[PDB]
């Protein structure tokens, strides 16, 4: 029960990344894709708790 927002690139190892995207530094925000071609198992559900 806490929220977090960030944009800095995550370093999975010892590689110093400060704005560049290395092979070990990945962007921690990955987006979806929502098309009618996808079936039931790949569609967005507005889950509310």
């Amino acid at each position, epitope marked *: 029960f806490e929220r977090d927002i960030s944009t800095e690139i995550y370093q999975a190892g010892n590689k110093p990344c400060n704005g560049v*995207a290395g092979f070990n530094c990945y962007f921690p925000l990955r987006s979806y894709g929502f098309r009618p071609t996808y079936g039931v198992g790949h569609q967005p559900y507005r889950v509310v708790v």
Partner: antibody
Amino acid sequence: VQLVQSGAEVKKPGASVKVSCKASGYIFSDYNIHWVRQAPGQGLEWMGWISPDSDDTNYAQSFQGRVTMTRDTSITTVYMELSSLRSDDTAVYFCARSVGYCSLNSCQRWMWFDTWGQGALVTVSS
Amino acid sequence: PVLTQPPSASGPPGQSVSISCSGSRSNIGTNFVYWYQQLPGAAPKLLIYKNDQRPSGVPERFFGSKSGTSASLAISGLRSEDEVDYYCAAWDDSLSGHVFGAGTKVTVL
């Protein structure tokens, strides 16, 4: 996909010009449309995106009130109403087809410009 | 800041050439780089998107990649019958907008 339109007519500075390109072959409720001009000898400039679903269009840092946009759901063609034309407006107008959809300011990195075709030519004149 | 490019490049046919697009940390690497190419007397067209997937409509001839601050578009050989400028574009949080490169002329030798 097609972007067939008509050539833009020459306008005096301190007037208005209209460019609109036809949309067909798809539903015009998912693709935010962009406007852009190809400046000679250099790159291009961006001013904002137009969403045909909700009134949530924004503006860039350097373009506040020079550009004005209105949407249309009956004809599915965006309308352009430019104001205060100057000498640096001497460039051709192409309507930029953008894949996908994006509203907030952290989803636009994934989109890329899809279709260019038969753009308009506009040069403000003495 | 503004993305810059060399005004022109000189590559003879028969050998590979590359085009560099110098940038910064906040525009290149953490944000994807697109490459626009426009025909003379016609409409532009995207060459490569997301620096690793090639669009459908072009054969396996070109190559593009990014390395930190700069991105390289490898052009394996050159045909004398087609000479087309290359544009460099990216995204920057500070300008919260799309900023475009200078553009490059490619010529035969």
